[PDB]
Design a protein around this nucleic acid. Structure first.
Ligand code: MG
Ligand code: MG
Ligand code: MG
Length: 127
RNA sequence: CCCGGGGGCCGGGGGCGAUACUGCCGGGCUAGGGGGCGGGAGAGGCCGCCGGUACUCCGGGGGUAGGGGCGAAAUCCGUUAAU
């Protein structure tokens, strides 16, 4: 039998965070961040960091019962970057190799339907 | 240079003529303008009510120990449970 769940990915430009939950999302089976499996701060948003963090979390997911999951990839949406960072693709690649059965893949980046004033003033982030 | 004569010295007033244009008075028009009627267009304004995601914070549940940020860090947030 297949027990289903959700692989939530947070792929910003500074890290990557993979929490695996049940279908309702109320219960977390595994959660690994990039810095949790990476030697230094500079290597957190690397795809290599995601690929280790992806396989490390999914290994716990299989050990704790979960055997098939969907993937919901996201970036920091709204007043930030509206697409997943440079580690989300590597994260899902290690997910497929981990033995999990893959369901649907969705982008759930929170899109503002207008917005709020974002940082960095008005001249820009180099002036 | 002096003498003689004509003109001008840009104007004022008088009389007699013309009425093309301007002016005034009278009559009449609709071409400029304004006032209308009809169906539509418009982030035009003021007021009232409602919504959409996003965000931040607060309360509770899951789960450990990182998160955040950078060129790289650090400050900072986090073991009174964070992301
Ligand atoms: Mg500034
Ligand atoms: Mg003379
Ligand atoms: Mg004289």
């Amino acid at each position: 039998k297949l027990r289903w769940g959700i692989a939530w990915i947070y792929s910003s430009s500074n890290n990557t965070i993979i929490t695996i939950t049940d279908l309702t999302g109320a219960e977390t089976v595994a959660r690994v961040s990039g810095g949790m499996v990476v030697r230094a701060d500079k290597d957190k948003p690397s795809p290599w960091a995601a690929m280790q963090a992806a396989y490390k979390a999914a290994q716990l997911a299989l050990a704790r019962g979960i055997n098939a999951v969907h993937i919901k990839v996201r970036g920091p949406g709204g007043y930030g970057m509206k697409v997943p960072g440079p580690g989300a693709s590597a994260a899902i690649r290690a997910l497929a190799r981990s033995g999990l059965v893959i369901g649907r893949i969705e982008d759930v980046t929170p899109i503002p339907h207008x917005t709020i004033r974002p940082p960095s003033g008005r001249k820009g982030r180099r002036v």
